Amino acid sequence: KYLFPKINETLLIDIALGNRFNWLAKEQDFIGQYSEEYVIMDTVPINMDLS
């Protein structure tokens, strides 16, 4: 009984490495360079000094 093997294993193991946040991905549209946002802050009701 004799003879031999075949060359190159080519295992190429790779893992796909998912991305852990992409439900936070919003659909940006690439126009304009500046975005901003605001609130108005609180104010308090005051006394009724009718004088």
Binding site: K1, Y2, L3, F4, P5, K6, I7, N8
Partner: protein, 55 residues
């Protein structure tokens, strides 16, 4: 039985498998193995290394 490694995902038979060779001609449940070469002595990746240097 389905003792062997199974590459598809959910399409597994989950039931009576068999080798369909000699149990009968054409009757048993199908899982037939296919050899590359009936009797194996030397791999032909060595013969392709054997001539390609001479070539």
């Amino acid at each position: 039985e389905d003792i062997y490694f199974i590459v598809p995902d959910y399409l597994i038979p989950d039931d009576c498998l068999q080798i369909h060779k000699l149990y009968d001609n054409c009757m048993s449940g199908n899982f037939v193995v296919m050899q590359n070469k009936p009797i194996q002595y030397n791999s032909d990746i060595e013969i392709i290394e054997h001539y390609t240097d001479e070539l």
